Every structure is written in structure tokens, then in C-alpha cells.
Write a structure and sequence with these properties.
Shape of chain A: elongated
Radius of gyration of chain A: 14 Å
Protein name (chain F): Beta-2-microglobulin
Largest sheet of chain A: 5 strands, antiparallel
Number of strands of chain A: 9
Subcellular location (chain F): Secreted; Cell surface
Number of helices of chain A: 0
Bound molecules: copper (II) ion
Number of domains of chain A: 1
Oligomer: homohexamer
Helix content of chain A: under 10%
CATH class of chain A: Mainly Beta
Family (chain F): Belongs to the beta-2-microglobulin family.
Strand content of chain A: over 45%
Organism (chain F): Homo sapiens
Distance between the termini of chain A: 37 Å
GO cellular component, one term (chain F): extracellular region
Chain lengths: 98, 98, 98, 98, 99, 95
């Protein structure tokens, strides 16, 4: 039907605590989930044990989907969500801000 | 990772009882659910208010998915599940066991 | 109120890929889940750690229920679902294909 | 294996407020849910639109199950849960204590 | 707007059988869940590995909530649910009875 | 054991569609829920919420949502009232 770039929300489950355990969420929405790739990055490197919800979709194949992993944020640690999709020339990276 | 033609299971939620209300299930599993289109048919005619579960998938984009609708079985009526996919040249229709 | 023999669907979570991990499903429906015994068989022999959903039922005690186990399909192994019920004089064994 | 009169807990979803919408719960547990009949009573009379969870059970067919309905409590009304079971000659009735 | 003493239900997941594994439930309901403390006690001792459901609430902040733990009942072991709340001057303890 | 101002995420369920139906999400997380007031604003009653999730130290998270059809000149926001905040904190939706 229509081609649009996927939108990314990056936030933590509980508010950020340095040292104390948490979860990092990446909520991805858009059209046509044609083998979409989603990664969570720890200082630019892929995080191994990431999990995801089932993919939700409607009749026109608009979709949403949640990726998450258990983590403990620290001082010199930055996190991001990377998405690869057919509408994108280059993978989009969204920084987590806490 | 592999191009395979999707597999379809067609069964009723409860044992098929003439007249009495029930649900008809279509379980679809395969690889790469690229805008896959699933319909439930009443005597070869597409049923309006069909519902589906979220789509489940794994790393290689193998998937499964459930389509269902409320219906009352009778002797005259014939039910089927129709699936359209880029792997299929003709839409694959699977007849209901009961 | 009405007496019927239980109905069995046997299918894999994802399409069968040899040497790679999957789940085997047995969907059972019928009337009166009176202490019903369901087993999954690997080459005639009962699989140890099988799991099941909660039992769903309606006013007339028609029911449905899902049994499942993690398994890796091989070309030599044969899988089946076995059901014991008061309605059956013989335990019903339905083989899995594909 | 064993046979026991089923156990019954009757409580309200939220703390009782006379004239404010609420839910009434009946939690039933026991062994061998052989077509168990559970009713919620308004002044000793069956309530028409009661709902239930799926039935949970373990290997030995011990079970638990929740029955519930929307209700609005008043000072002039008595609510109860009635259970019919193969172990009971008289239907067991437990009055709501709030 | 109004506040009362929270209500506690203590029951086992399955009917109690000695030696056999089970779960112990504590269902708590009331008004204003303001940092409510719930413990399950084994012989007057706080059980460490307890779990809880999410807290459910409505517009007026009436709430309900389920606490539970896996246990194997024995003839002599006493179980109870203890709740601390700003409405309660003394901690309220509800003992578990099998019937 | 630590009084902190709550964090807010405002996003739509599906991508923003002018004239078509969607859901608006407000994800709130903080410490000590204690009778927290969350509203969704249009320039809205029948808002819904998930159960409240919490851990031992009473850190919490919670989701508020409502159905809607966005158009051109419609402004949506999430407003939160808490004992930490002197004034109700409002976070706008940017799509
Ligand atoms: Cu499109
Ligand atoms: Cu492939
Ligand atoms: Cu019958
Ligand atoms: Cu028994
Ligand atoms: Cu109050
Ligand atoms: Cu604090």
C-alpha cells in the first residue's frame, strides 16, 4: 500500500539506576515487517541475549513489536537500538538518553 | 533463510456440533511472512470478521500465526483456509476435516 | 450430555527442519475431559517432559487443551500423540506427518 | 488416586463498597474436575452471566479454577458460591463474608 | 477519597496435601496501595523467595494484588500472610487454614 | 528509599496516520506510585491503563493508552501528577 520508515522508541523499564539491574526496551512500529532486523547495542556492539514480543499487525500490514534485554547501566556505558529495513539505505540508530 | 511454502492446519475450537456455536481455526506456519494474506472461506466465499493472534517468529524469520472466527457448523456449509504468499503461484486452499 | 470420542491435531510449532530445534503440538478437543490422559510418543515411547496449557471448557463441558514439547526432528524418528479416554476402548494414536 | 470435597474461596475483586461496581470471585480447587458445576448465587438464586478462567491441573488431576461476575453489592443482598461435584451429595454453598 | 483496612485472603493453589509441592496465595485488596508491605510467614519467619502479580487499580485507587510462593506443606508448619499499611497501627497477620 | 521525579514516554501504537485509527501510549516509570494521576490530553476521558508493575523497593512502571484518529492540527500530550512534582509534568507527542 504505502512505504514508510519504521519509528523507534528507546527507554528503560524502571528509571535508570547505576549498578542496579533493569531492562532496556526498543519499541519499533511501521509498515511491512518484511524480515526486519532489530539489534540492541552496548557501546556500538550487538548485545547477544536480546528478546522480543510477538509481532502485532493490522489488515494493511502496519506493525508494532518490542525488543528488550536485561541490563545494569553504569557510568561510561551507552546504549542504542539499531534497525535494518528495506525502506532504509543505512541502518537507523537511536540513542538511549539516561 | 529458506524459501518454503507455508503449512496450514484447519480445525475447530470445539468438536463440530451441528447448529451449536463454535470457532474455526487456521494455524499457519512457514518462513518469511512478507505481507502474507490469510482468509477463511464459507463455501468458497471470504468471511468478513476474521481475527488473528500476534505473529510469532524466531531469528531466521520462521513464523507461526493463528487465524480464527466464530461460526455455527451445518450439513450444507463447507469451510476452508486460503493462504496467499509470494512462494505460492496459486493460492493454497485447505479444506476443513469436519 | 452427549458422548463423543476426542479429536486430535498433531503439528509442529514451525515447519519441520531436520537437526534444528522445534516444538511438537497436540491439540485435543472433545466432551468431558474426565481425567483424560494425553502422551506424546517418540518411536512409540512416551516422551518424559511434556507440557500442557490450561484446559478450556464451556457450559456443556465441551473442552479443548494443548499438549506440547521441545524436540528436534530427525529423518528417522517418528512422532505421535496418544489419548486415553473413557469413550475409547483403545488408546487413540494419531501420527505426525511432514 | 484420592478423592476429596473441593475447596471454595469467596471474595470480592475490590473491597466492598455498597452501591459501587465490583466483581465477585469464587476460587475452587480439588481433585478430578469431573464435570464440576459452579454457580454464583444472588439471594440463593443462580446468577445468569457468570464467567470462568481456564481450568488448571497437574499430573494427578488436582485442579483449580476461578469463577467471577460483575456485581454491585447492597446491604440487603446475600451472595454465595455453590458447587456440585461427584464427592458431594448436597451442593456445597459458601456465603460471601463481606 | 475514603480509606479502610485492607482485606486479606490466604489459600493454597491446590488443596493441601502433606509432602506434595504446592503454592501459597495471599490476595490483598484495599484503598491507596501507598508502598504496601506484604510478607508470607513460615512459623513466624518471613519467607524470602516470594513473588507477586502486577498491582491492579481503578480510578479511585482501590487496588488488588496477589502474593505467592512455592512450598510443600507439612503437618506442623504454620503459614500466614502479614500486611503493613499506613491505616494499620499494628501489622495484621492472617493465618492459613486448610479446612 | 529514594524520592525521584517520574519519567514519561509518549508514542503511538502504529505509525502516525492522518484520518486513520490508532492508539496513543503513555509509559510512566518512577519511585513510589502512591495515588499517581496520569492523564492524556487533547489540546480525554475513557483512557485505559495496564496493571502497575513494581519491584521490592517500590520502583514502578505503568502504561496508559487510548484509541484515537490523528489529523493535522491536533496536539496530544501526557500529564502526570506526583508528590515529587510541584507542577504537573506534561510531555508532548512529536509525531
Ligand atoms: Cu504499504
Ligand atoms: Cu528463508
Ligand atoms: Cu456429554
Ligand atoms: Cu484421586
Ligand atoms: Cu481514600
Ligand atoms: Cu524512594
Amino acid at each position: 500500500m504505502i512505504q514508510r520508515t519504521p519509528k523507534i522508541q528507546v527507554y528503560s523499564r524502571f528509571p535508570a539506576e547505576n549498578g542496579k539491574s533493569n531492562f532496556l526496551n526498543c519499541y519499533v512500529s511501521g509498515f511491512h515487517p518484511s524480515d526486519i532486523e532489530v539489534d540492541l547495542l552496548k557501546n556500538g556492539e550487538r548485545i547477544e541475549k536480546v528478546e522480543h514480543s510477538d509481532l502485532s499487525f493490522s489488515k494493511d500490514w502496519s506493525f508494532y513489536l518490542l525488543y528488550y534485554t536485561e541490563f545494569t547501566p553504569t557510568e561510561k556505558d551507552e546504549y542504542a537500538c539499531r534497525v535494518n529495513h528495506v525502506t532504509l539505505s543505512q541502518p537507523k540508530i537511536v540513542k538511549w538518553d539516561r
